[PDB]
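Morning!

As promised:
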Amino acid sequence: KACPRPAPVPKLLIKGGMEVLDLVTGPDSVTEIEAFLNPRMGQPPTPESLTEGGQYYGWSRGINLATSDTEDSPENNTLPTWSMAKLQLPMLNEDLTCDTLQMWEAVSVKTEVVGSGSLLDVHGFNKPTDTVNTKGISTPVEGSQYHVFAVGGEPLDLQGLVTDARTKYKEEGVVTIKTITKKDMVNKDQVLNPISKAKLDKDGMYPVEIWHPDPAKNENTRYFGNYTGGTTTPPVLQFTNTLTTVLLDENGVGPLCKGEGLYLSCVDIMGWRVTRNYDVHHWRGLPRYFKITLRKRWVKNPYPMASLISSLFNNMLPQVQGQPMEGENTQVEEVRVYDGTEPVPGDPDMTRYVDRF
Amino acid sequence: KACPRPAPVPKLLIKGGMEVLDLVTGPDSVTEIEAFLNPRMGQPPTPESLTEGGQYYGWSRGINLATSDTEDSPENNTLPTWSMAKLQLPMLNEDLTCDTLQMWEAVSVKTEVVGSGSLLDVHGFNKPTDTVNTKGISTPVEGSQYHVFAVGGEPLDLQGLVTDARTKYKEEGVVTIKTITKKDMVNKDQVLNPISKAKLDKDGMYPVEIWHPDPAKNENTRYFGNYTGGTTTPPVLQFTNTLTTVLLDENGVGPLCKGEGLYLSCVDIMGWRVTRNYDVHHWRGLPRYFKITLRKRWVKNPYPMASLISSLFNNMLPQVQGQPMEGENTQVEEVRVYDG
Amino acid sequence: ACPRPAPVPKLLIKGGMEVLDLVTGPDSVTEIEAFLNPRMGQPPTPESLTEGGQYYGWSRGINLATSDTEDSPENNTLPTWSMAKLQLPMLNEDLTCDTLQMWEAVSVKTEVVGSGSLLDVHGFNKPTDTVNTKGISTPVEGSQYHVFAVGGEPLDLQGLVTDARTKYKEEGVVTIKTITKKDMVNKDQVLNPISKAKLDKDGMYPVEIWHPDPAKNENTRYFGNYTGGTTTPPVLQFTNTLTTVLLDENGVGPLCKGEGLYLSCVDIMGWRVTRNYDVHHWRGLPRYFKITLRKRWVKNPYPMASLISSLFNNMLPQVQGQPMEGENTQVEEVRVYDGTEPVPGDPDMTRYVDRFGKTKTVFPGN
Amino acid sequence: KACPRPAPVPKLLIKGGMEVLDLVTGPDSVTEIEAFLNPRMGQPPTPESLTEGGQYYGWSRGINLATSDTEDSPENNTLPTWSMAKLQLPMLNEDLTCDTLQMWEAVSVKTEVVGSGSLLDVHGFNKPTDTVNTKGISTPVEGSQYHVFAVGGEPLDLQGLVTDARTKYKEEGVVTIKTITKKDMVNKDQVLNPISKAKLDKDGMYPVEIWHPDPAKNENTRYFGNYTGGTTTPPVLQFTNTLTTVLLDENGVGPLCKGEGLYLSCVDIMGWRVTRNYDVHHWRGLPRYFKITLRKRWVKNPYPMASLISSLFNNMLPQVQGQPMEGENTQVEEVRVYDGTEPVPGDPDMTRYVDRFGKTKTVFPG
Amino acid sequence: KACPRPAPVPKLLIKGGMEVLDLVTGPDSVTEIEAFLNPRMGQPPTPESLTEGGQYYGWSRGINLATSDTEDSPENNTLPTWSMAKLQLPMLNEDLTCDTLQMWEAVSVKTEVVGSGSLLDVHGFNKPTDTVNTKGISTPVEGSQYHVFAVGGEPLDLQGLVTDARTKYKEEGVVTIKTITKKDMVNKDQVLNPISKAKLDKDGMYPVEIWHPDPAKNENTRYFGNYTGGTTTPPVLQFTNTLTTVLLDENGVGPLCKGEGLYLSCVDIMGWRVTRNYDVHHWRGLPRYFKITLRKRWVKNPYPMASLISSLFNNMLPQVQGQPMEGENTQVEEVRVYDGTEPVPGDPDMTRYVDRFGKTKTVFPGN
């Protein structure tokens, strides 16, 4: 019979939690994972009591200024930090007989900051707008805004850069340039220092005013950030469920999930609220929703089994000290490789740079 | 033949009200419904009197600040809320032999916030611009703005999120997170609690500072919002009758009307006006106009007919208590089965 | 053989509205250019620069209310809608083949003129350094409102006011009370489907009351934008290259009913604050229009009997008369005869079509 | 056997100054002219010495405010004006045989306001930021901005519009509306007066607060402007060397250079400088660089349409004032019309008219 | 034999430092160089101690205003300058048979200003937001902003322009207009002088408030700048690793690296930091990262190598200073060129000439 024919649409196989990923689906199946990340900026979630910690959860604890030009030691519960998660996806392959192997590949992302209309709470005990009578409206969140999000297959590579290289960050509880380099910061740390490099592996530990997304040579992460400074800049946010970001690069690949993990990073700063006291500011952050679309991709084997065959050659032998054949005090003078045959050249050690003339 | 031919345009079959939807038109017919939603924010429309209400209709009543860091009671007639409507559409065809149904499907929307030029009213008893001599102009509406609107085939899903979670919202007349989750707010309700969820179903009841459009796993609603903060930010609004918004998704479907209803939701905050007194800060909201274009779509029934019949009967009949016929104190004695 | 030129469109005649009379052809294009002046408060009529001080192009002042309940806005302080109507020539007076022909606006080049005029920072306005009354004469600033419309009929408006307790003067201005002969209600502060109007007059409908109304089906394209605030730098961009297409979803654009082309406009730039009590004056700028029209073949939607009855109903006066309709009607019986039948035995039998056929009605005897 | 092939690229024929245009290059050649206009807005370039004129060159002299609502004399050296230049291109057609001429034709323009980084000079003698202790930063250039530029084959047509129509401008040194109308300004000059119209043909002469690019009937100029008002608005500028503007219109022509002249007009106002005194404001303007790409276009010869056939159809009407040939004091004695041929009648002074429908010979005397 | 095939992507031969470029690869090979430039914004990097300089590195030292209208003399460590770098690439092939050689060609650039989130340091010793009690937030960096970056095959052409032509810029440590034109600045230099032009060969030497990218008739560099002014304007910065700038032009070429070098120029000013003592207004600048993608392109040699090597060998011959056979005091009295044969003409003193296309016998001299 001449039936009506509804339009063809992707067929849902299964819908649920993270356990749904154990169903073996096939090579051309598409997964849509939905997650969120909370603003971990200052006060942790660990004291749940609305009285014990006052529940500045979602806020910082209060910005204390420096006592002198040389004396700057803020606090850890005052610095907003990077939120991150890692989604552990199921292992895909058993194919170590041909050097192809399939992993997960982030294709699209639908992301959104949640809670913007809550910034319309203009009652409450914040500094009023009419201050000479202490009436009017509770001043809403304003100031500097910082919105970065990243989606990759490895942790976000970071780059250290600070306003003052003499700030005394605590040596415990927070990851600082000194935590990585193991020595106090230099003047090259207020500009780009190629040495101040870390990875976003901890969550709520790397402050966003030290660590910024690193534009490394080759990368497996797509990050999108934007900054708005000032003291009373109005917050501006736009939400909708209608637009996606494409995560594919020029080769049309997009983040390959190595290991099997998918890393999400974010920081959403809306500004600060100033209290009804000495003008104590508290940073506000809002959560970010993620919707990552993953497909399966055939790649060339990223597991070198020669690594295992040579770790077997190496763990049979002791570890040796010796004289340096690596680094800046290398005692290796020269390495040259020959592959084919050529006509005998003239000058064979000939400079190919004109400035060497 | 001899004389010219005008260009072809869509043929209008009928024009009128929601009554004209009862005309059976066919499978390829397109419907356009004009409608508007009013700014339900603060003062309700019930006291129509311009003296006993002062007529803050269209405005909020007046924002009272918290008395301490722990005491904060915000007076429901102060909080702007979500406006919503539901348009009941006619039942459609079906084809039981192929198991296909017909349902309505929103295809595009023309929306607009009406009344922007009314904010050029600079006479009146607002805080003057030259306040030392009380001269100048009456300060216009300024401040934080919030413009969200949604068009779906079912009520908009909401996600609870607040500033201080110690706020004492009134336990009647408003929908709080405590109304939904019968416990008090926790500290996780200041960031994102998957437990703090709701549906924008009543109207003028869900405060816009508690309830935000929730990005659920799978969705049947297209919402578009934007927020502008501050205390003196100039309102900006652009109106035209010339641009449309496509409600179709990646597969090209757009909001299918569950049951048979088409749900419209909006909130359009413009800022505050300040009075010539203690600086109370009434909100202003403007109405939103909707023009939804709908068509009929052939969809596939995803459920067995026996399951739908069982559900119909389970919802038809009242849940009775009764004497125990299952369990350990059963009153059924024997059950026998014969065949032949 | 020497080089030939390129096919530029051929100009038949240029001039004024005189040029629209000459019969041009079926597929000719007309470009009409016009302008609308800012009619906001002070009218053009006292042309002397000393009597009205010539706030022409400006408003007259701003008078704050005296209490919550008593606000009187003083008509010369309210900016209003500018409008015009271009009377185009009749097209099909000759005849028609059950399809007429009307003018159709396809495009519009528009522009607000005089923005560099706002660089006059000399003059007697509130100085920048207000302690020593030196510096710069504060330029025009504040709330801006730019709307324009191009249609084939007057712009429909929707009433909406900041306050419904405002006492607009009952003469010289059109308000919600003028159109709905009652007072304003609280619903007139949100959206009343009842407070509607047409942009009929010019310099009469204030823009703080009357907004372009999104009706169901429309013959007008309007584009507007509003920028609030008190200081709010003015921003304006003028160019002789951008065009607006007036064709709609179906590719038609505004069909000129009758043969009129209606332009509406309001371009508010902000206020000038005087060196006095801080009296504010609205500033507006003229708007230039360039509308491109063509002739469209259009089918008549209405039947001839309807048009003839409309003609006669608008010619003849409307009658009060005695009640031949209603519950106290004075009509006694109405009989209709169509064919012929044998003589019925009852002369006053009743006959009526219930649903399909006429049924004779006995009187209730048995 | 083979050897590589670079990619095709337009071949440069010659490169130099304006004399390079003397080489005859054929019909399909393309010319690119770089040029700049300086801000001639305020103090003139003439006194070169850095003490005599203080060297407010590039700047304006101090803005002086009005003394009362009726006395306003704005002191020519404080009034930014339009920059304009004309480039005389070589004359193309040397053959009068057939009906085709050749014109220059501006196709594209790369333009740029250069010097924006100079506005970061915050050392200097300006109103400080912390003016209490007179310390901080010398306040940078801020305020209201105005950037216009035009490229055409004719001088830019201007329209007059003023903030105040009293505004006693000096009568020599600038071209005001009175300089053109010969009468005092009227109130219609604060709105669009179709009479206050000029052409930008002198440089440093037409103030930007009086004269604005006129959207006229038919045009041979592409102008792009934008305005930002206010008193402390931050200046914004975006310079690059990658984007070009297309000057072709809807028919794809672009400004045809008549008389072989190319006209560049510009005004780039950046805001004000405030002095460490009474808050005396000085306008800052920056130069504008142009790169116009020109080609040759075959146009039709217009001269065969001589002036006697192309008679005074345009606004070539000087006026009518003469002895009365109309009205009741008319001096026309008699008019008669003849069309055909008839047999010789009797009375040669017979009068003959045509009634409401047809012809009738008036009865004879008697 | 039947395993699935991954998709083809560009094959990386090798990666490392600038030494990796010494491997001869082939005509269709593509290189991508990642680099960065630090802000040369007043104070230099060299006094690296955090107390000897206070380390205003990345900042300027402090803006000292003019004492009078006529004398304005700024310190060199208070003027932000252009950052630049040259990247010397290897030599490529040549082909004297058809006089073509291949050059390096910049095709794309991914650029980014790094460190925007460092401007969220609102603790610290700056002018507080509530000044009557010296509490609140230490005011963040704000003010006038200036972001330019350029990528080319030759050094960036500059064009001088100043607010005041009467400023006393120090004669050493900074390249001003007076350094290039040995005279003082004139009033033409406040507007536009086609005379005050320079290149960007040095680094930390050309101040940004004097030297602006010049839109010359010609150019081999692509530059992108934008300026935002004011006193309290908030900084705005957008960063991502996903946006690319196409450096090709109308003909689709893009910057050709003459002299094998590739030139990066930048200045990224974010505003001022105001100190607590007075309103001292140090500038702030952030580093810019560049990822430039280069390819090899065959180009025609513009100048024939014959004339070049001829002039090279002629400069080996002794140069002599004899009696003038050149110029206006020439002792050359006659030069005649005969080529063919013709019937014996009339006037034996005839003059023949060539007028911009072809030979014309000079007009019959009895005019």
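Chains B and E do not touch (no CB pair under 8 Å).

Hope this helps with the figure draft.
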